[PDB]
Every structure is written in structure tokens, then in C-alpha cells.
UniProtKB/Swiss-Prot annotation:
Reactions accelerated catalytically: taurocyamine + ATP = N-phosphotaurocyamine + ADP + H(+)
Keyword Hydrolase annotated: no
Species: Schistosoma mansoni
Cofactor(s) named in the record: Mg(2+)
Gene Ontology CC annotation, any one: extracellular space
Active site: residue positions: C268, C631
PROSITE patterns tied to this protein: PHOSPHAGEN_KINASE (PS00112), PHOSPHAGEN_KINASE_C (PS51510), PHOSPHAGEN_KINASE_N (PS51509)
Record domain Phosphagen kinase C-terminal: where: 116-352, 479-706
Keyword rRNA processing: no
Gene3D superfamilies: ATP:guanido phosphotransferase, N-terminal domain (1.10.135.10), Glutamine synthetase/guanido kinase, catalytic domain (3.30.590.10)
Residue intervals of the Phosphagen kinase N-terminal domain: 5-86, 368-449
Ranges occupied by Approximate repeats: 1-363, 364-670
A Pfam family assignment: ATP-gua_Ptrans
Name recorded for this polypeptide: Taurocyamine kinase
């Protein structure tokens, strides 16, 4: 196989913005310098290994010119392998092959868990010693290898008796039939093509099928041998035993390449070690729809792959689920990982299907409350409010209860269940604060340091916007880089961004954007829908650090990025001093900000904007808690006023710093600090903003003191 110089290929791979391969990561100048003239014992080069990466930027891994590539270019491949297979300290190792005690081995049938499994399949691969891969084979040696292998296959007994079909000479009718039965491989993978996989096509290649059509062998498709056992249903035990028996028998005839670092050598580094991929095709539509579906699988040792194109338009939810591990465990370990993980996932699909019977369409499905309560046990019952008030009696009372529009207690603890450092829940709608009052009210009281009162929450008390008790906290040069006040708001009648449906989001966005497009004067601006945005607008939003990404795991697992990015957007005025985020965590975050320390002007602009928006919709409001928001941490005023404060001196006596913050009820985050009022509930908007001002005024006058 003739390919470009390694240095050329490196430049191509590096200059390609679409390429994010591990090949790109580890094919360094030093690596090129070391290996650009080196040949394996079969005469292969590193250029031949990385060639496909130069032309296929989507490819993650190199391939190998022959089995000696891993040793010959070890500094490169060990780095790639350690990275891909997540090998701890680059301490790559692999145990001797062990399929287990076949006579006594037994796994439960996977269809026990809801009868969701269409089929079960286990695959392995082998390299025959003494022969190269695609780039280093000759036409003759590939055929010699094929002959060696078909002869070994012809010698399998009973169960494995069947027919060898060489590709060469195969009629097009047989070709059509065999690909229709999914027994035949084709030359249709460009990554494989550019790694030398189809040289001298179709010679030296073929397939073998037994009479029962549950055992299938590919010769020289990519690896020397790929062996596949398969059948309808969930009989993993039989599939795996059938596979194990055959390869053990074949081993008596063929010498397979193995070393105690990588295990069984394969053409692609992803399939080293056991080479084993045990899998099922399963119907798991509800599980597949969870926001952290992928993470859930990985945590159970499972890798999911979509099967789109393989089924009808109205039947998706069918996935391939396999062991995620190949290297660093035995075959028995790997199929056990598969069985255990898949069993857990199918049991979870069954639980989802049952717990969400009757729930509104488009509303986020949720795991059973008691399941999530177990995951939440990893949270500190001392710092995590979500767990602290989730008592046995609360679980018993509220399990299986829904609000009128479908919100559950399970919904609201989910973010904590899957992110144990998260300390507050995320509610599903305003009604949550009465339907689940026994959970939420003590939690709220605890978080905000308050207690049950006979009196209605104070009405919105914004103050006289022409005679405010604060002005410019820093007229002079700089203690204050910038000032900001924001509030959260929920719109009456809508489920919150956690669980709301796609149609809900679309309607919400029509209500809110309609109001925003009508704002005038200082508040006049432009709405930028995340769905229909001009790219230059998109770039500029990112430039200004006006971000709205689906990248927070806490929000994600509460469901806040579902049906992305429909109904989401950013509004701001031309000056970028008044902005609204639409449907992130709350229906709205309404924000006023500007350079300098003029809090009175930021506050005034904010209040006038809230009022203007409020003309077109009713804000969710509570006699108990004031303005209602998704997170209970942001009730009452839902107001956060803040400054970007430069205090080089005081930040270096940091506990007469963290003591002001304490006694003036401020929060600080990093001599430049972001300082904000900590209180939200139990005070008026005016007091909230005044507390920040008084606290910041103290800090500043403390600062000049040093
Ligand atoms: N046997 C194989 N086809 N291996 C290819 C695995 C794909 C690989 N992770 C890549 O993107 O390079």
C-alpha cells in the first residue's frame, strides 16, 4: 500500500479543523521524527497506520499496518490505547484468556426483564500469526491466510457444520441474498478503505455460516477472523457458549497473536484485549429518552448504539447495548459486565414504563421515587437539602402522587440523585409548592433561614424608583468594574423548563417573545431564538459571553435541556444593558447590568423591564413564598444584585473578608470578587438591593482602610 510521507499525513491531520482524533493528539513532531523511517518486521510503516485519519476526520483511532505495529511504534500506540481504553496510569495490561467454566456457566435469559430483547449476539476477532493486515498483505498471502482459515473452519464438528462462501466468484444473487440476511460484508466503509482494507477486492475474503444460521465467520473483512454467534431472543448463555466452544476449537489449528499487554491483537485498537462485544438489540424507548441515557449506560458498564435505518419510521427506541470494556479483563468478566449491566437497564425500562403509566405526553418520564432515593444516598445528608428532607414518611406519603399537570417528587430530586453535590431540588410546576408542601416547606425554611408565618408574603415592594436609598456605589475610578441585578420569573399556566413538553416550550416562547419584541425605549431590543438564529448573531453572542449551552449536568438531569433547543433564546437591547434569557432553568431570567457602580440606574432599568414584561402575562406568585421559581433557592424576590468588585487588599485578609460577607449576608466568588446579596426570601426587593449596596459600601470603605 503506497501512501504519502508520515510528515505530510501529520500536517494534513493537524491542519484539519474537523479532525479531533487520538491520532491527531499523539502524532507529535517527536513521534514523527522518531518513526518516519522505521519499518515493522512485516515491512509496514506508521504512515500506513495513520493514513485513514488524514482522509476521514471523523475517525477516532489509527489502524495498524500489521500486528507488529503496536510494538514497532509503541510510544505512539501505547499513548493512543491508554487514552481510548481509559487505562489508569498508562499501565496497559491484559489477563490470559478465560471464557469461564462452560459446563457450569449460566446467565438468566435477558427477556426475563420485560421481554424487550429482539436478539442477542456475541462477537470476537483474531489475528493469525505470521500475516500482515490490509497494508502489508500481498495478493498471495491474503489468499494463503484465507485457505489456512477455511481449512480450520472445515474441521469444526457437529453444531458448526456449514458452508464456506468465498467472495470471489459469488453470484450477485447470492450476494444480494446474503447481505439481505445480514451475513455478508461489503466494501462500503471509507475508513476501512483508506486504511488498506479493500486492497485486491474481493480476493482472499469470504464468509462461513453453519446450518443452524446462528454461527457466522468473516474472513479478511478487516481482521483476519471475525467470529459471531447470534440468535433471536435473549439466550445469552447459549450464544456465548456457542462462540466460546468454536474459538477454542479453532485455536487448536490456528496460532493467534496475543501478548500480555494488549491481549489479542486486532486491526483496530478499539477491539484489543478480549476483542469481545456481547450485545442485545433491545426496545428501551423510555430509558433512551432520559437526558443522561448515555451516562446511565456507561455507569452500568454498557455502551449504547442507535439502530436508526434498521427499523420502521414509527418504531425507534430499539438500541444495541453491549459491554463497554474490551481490554484489561477476561472474556468471562466482559460477558458478565454485559449481562449485569443490560439486565439493570432493562429492569429500569420496565420500572419507567410502569411508574409513568398515565402521565402526560411530552412530559419528562422519571424513575420511581424509591430508585432515585437510593441514588441520592451518596449525597451528604448534612449539606444536601434535597436528601435531608426526603424522609421515609415523606417517601411513603408522596410516592405515586402527581400534581394536576404531572409533576412528581421523583422529578424534583432527580438532579440530586444523579449529581450528589447538588444541594437543592428542581420543581416541575408552581403547584409543586402546595402538592408537596410537606417536603418543600421545611426545606425552604431551612435553606432561607425562616419559618412558617400567618401572613401573606409581602407584595412586590420595588420602591420609589426616583427616590431610591442607593445611588452610585463608586463614582470615582474603580472599586467596581460593573453592576448587575437580575430576577427569576415563572409564567402562570406553564410547566417549568424541567419537565414541560416541546409544545409547552413553543407556546411559552410565543408568549414571552411577543412581549419582548414589543418593549420600547431603553428596553427595546432583539430576540434571538436558539432555533432560528443568524450565525453572525450566534458568533457575537458567544463573543460577548452571552452563552446558553446544554452543558450543565445538574440542569440536564432535571430535564432542562430536553427537546433542545426548542423555545430557548436570548433577548437584549442594543446597549446590552437589559437582557432576558428565555426558558433556561426558569421561564425567564430578567437581567439589568452596566459598567461602573451605578446600582440605582441598573435597578431602575430592571424594575421598569419587569413591569413592562408583566403587562403581557401573569407571573407565578405565592402567598407563602412570593415569586415562584423552579429552584426553591430562588423564591421570594428571586433577586440577585451583584457587583464585580476590585479589593486587592481585603482579599488578602480573607476572613475579615468572609466575615463581612457573613454579617452583611453577602456571597463572594473569585483581587477581583463577584459580590452579591445572599438573601432571596423574607425581605423586599428594595431591601435585597440595599443589603448588597450597604455590604459593598462597607467593603469599599474597609478597603481604603488597608
Ligand atoms: N474494528 C473496528 N471497525 N474498529 C473501529 C472502531 C472505530 C474507532 N473508534 C474510530 O473511530 O477509529
Amino acid at each position: 500500500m503506497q501512501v504519502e510521507s508520515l510528515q505530510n499525513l501529520q500536517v494534513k491531520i493537524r491542519n484539519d479543523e474537523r479532525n479531533h482524533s487520538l491520532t491527531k493528539k499523539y502524532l507529535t513532531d517527536d513521534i514523527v521524527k522518531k518513526y518516519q523511517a522505521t519499518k515493522t518486521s512485516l515491512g509496514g510503516t506508521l504512515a500506513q497506520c495513520v493514513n485513514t485519519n488524514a482522509y476521514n476526520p471523523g475517525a477516532l483511532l489509527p489502524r495498524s499496518c500489521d500486528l507488529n505495529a503496536y510494538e514497532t511504534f509503541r510510544d505512539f500506540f501505547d499513548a493512543v490505547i491508554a487514552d481510548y481504553h481509559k487505562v489508569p496510569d498508562g499501565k496497559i495490561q491484559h489477563p490470559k484468556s478465560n471464557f469461564g467454566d462452560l459446563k457450569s456457566l449460566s446467565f438468566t435469559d435477558l427477556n426475563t426483564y420485560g421481554n424487550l430483547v429482539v436478539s442477542t449476539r456475541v462477537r470476537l476477532g483474531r489475528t493469525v500469526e505470521g500475516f500482515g493486515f490490509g497494508p502489508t498483505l500481498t495478493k498471495e498471502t491474503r489468499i494463503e491466510l484465507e485457505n489456512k482459515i477455511s481449512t480450520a473452519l472445515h474441521n469444526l464438528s457437529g453444531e458448526y457444520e456449514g458452508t464456506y462462501y468465498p467472495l470471489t466468484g459469488m453470484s450477485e444473487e447470492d450476494r444480494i441474498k446474503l447481505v439481505n440476511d445480514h451475513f455478508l460484508f461489503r466494501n462500503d466503509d471509507n475508513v476501512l478503505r483508506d486504511a488498506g482494507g479493500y486492497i485486491d477486492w474481493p480476493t482472499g475474503r469470504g464468509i462461513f455460516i453453519n446450518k443452524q444460521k446462528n454461527f457466522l465467520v468473516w474472513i479478511n473483512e478487516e481482521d483476519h477472523i471475525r467470529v459471531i454467534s447470534m440468535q433471536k431472543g435473549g439466550g445469552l448463555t447459549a450464544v456465548y457458549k456457542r462462540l466460546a466452544d468454536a474459538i477454542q476449537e479453532l485455536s487448536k489449528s490456528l496460532k493467534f497473536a496475543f501478548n500480555d499487554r494488549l491481549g489479542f491483537i486486532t486491526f483496530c485498537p478499539s477491539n484489543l484485549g478480549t476483542t469481545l462485544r456481547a450485545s442485545v438489540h433491545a426496545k428501551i424507548p423510555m430509558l433512551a429518552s432520559l437526558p443522561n441515557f448515555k451516562e446511565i449506560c456507561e455507569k452500568h458498564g454498557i455502551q449504547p448504539r442507535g439502530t436508526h435505518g434498521e427499523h420502521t419510521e414509527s418504531v425507534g427506541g430499539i438500541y444495541d447495548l453491549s459491554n463497554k470494556r474490551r481490554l484489561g479483563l477476561t472474556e468471562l468478566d466482559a460477558v458478565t459486565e454485559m449481562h449485569s449491566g443490560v439486565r439493570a437497564l432493562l429492569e429500569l425500562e420496565v420500572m419507567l414504563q410502569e411508574y409513568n403509566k398515565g402521565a402526560p405526553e411530552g412530559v419528562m418520564p422519571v424513575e420511581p421515587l424509591t430508585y432515585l432515593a437510593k441514588l441520592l444516598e451518596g449525597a451528604s445528608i448534612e449539606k444536601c437539602y434535597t436528601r435531608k428532607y426526603l424522609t421515609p414518611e415523606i417517601i411513603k406519603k408522596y410516592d405515586g402522587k402527581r400534581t394536576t399537570h404531572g409533576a412528581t417528587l421523583a422529578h424534583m430530586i432527580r438532579n440530586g440523585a444523579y449529581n450528589n453535590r447538588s444541594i437543592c431540588p428542581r420543581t416541575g410546576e408552581a403547584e409543586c409548592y402546595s402538592t408537596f408542601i410537606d417536603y418543600l416547606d421545611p426545606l425552604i425554611c431551612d435553606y432561607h433561614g425562616v419559618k412558617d408565618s400567618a401572613f401573606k408574603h409581602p407584595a412586590p415592594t420595588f420602591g420609589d424608583l426616583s427616590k431610591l436609598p442607593f445611588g452610585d456605589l463608586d463614582p470615582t475610578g474603580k472599586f467596581i468594574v460593573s453592576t448587575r441585578v437580575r430576577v427569576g420569573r415563572s409564567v402562570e399556566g406553564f410547566l417549568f423548563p424541567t419537565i414541560m413538553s416541546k409544545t409547552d416550550r413553543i407556546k411559552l416562547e410565543q408568549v414571552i417573545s411577543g412581549a419582548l419584541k414589543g418593549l420600547t425605549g431603553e428596553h427595546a431590543g432583539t430576540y434571538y431564538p436558539l432555533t432560528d438564529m443568524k450565525e453572525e448573531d450566534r458568533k457575537q453572542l458567544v463573543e460577548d459571553h452571552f452563552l446558553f449551552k446544554n452543558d450543565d449536568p445538574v440542569l440536564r438531569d432535571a430535564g432542562g435541556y430536553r427537546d433542545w433547543p426548542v423555545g430557548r433564546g436570548i433577548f437584549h437591547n442594543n446597549s446590552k444593558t437589559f437582557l432576558v434569557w428565555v426558558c433556561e432553568e426558569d421561564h425567564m431570567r430578567i437581567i439589568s447590568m452596566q459598567q461602573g457602580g451605578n446600582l440605582a440606574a441598573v435597578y431602575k432599568r430592571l424594575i421598569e423591564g419587569i413591569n413592562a414584561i408583566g403587562k403581557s402575562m401573569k407571573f407565578a406568585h405565592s402567598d407563602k413564598y412570593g415569586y415562584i421559581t423552579c429552584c426553591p433557592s430562588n423564591l421570594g424576590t428571586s433577586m440577585r444584585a451583584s457587583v464585580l468588585l476590585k479589593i486587592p487588599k481585603l482579599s488578602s485578609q480573607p476572613k475579615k473578608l468572609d466575615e463581612i460577607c457573613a454579617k452583611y449576608m453577602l456571597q463572594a466568588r473569585g483581587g477581583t470578587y463577584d459580590i452579591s446579596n445572599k438573601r432571596r426570601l423574607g425581605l423586599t426587593e428594595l431591601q435585597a438591593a440595599h443589603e448588597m449596596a450597604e455590604g459593598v459600601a462597607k467593603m469599599i470603605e474597609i478597603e481604603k482602610g488597608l
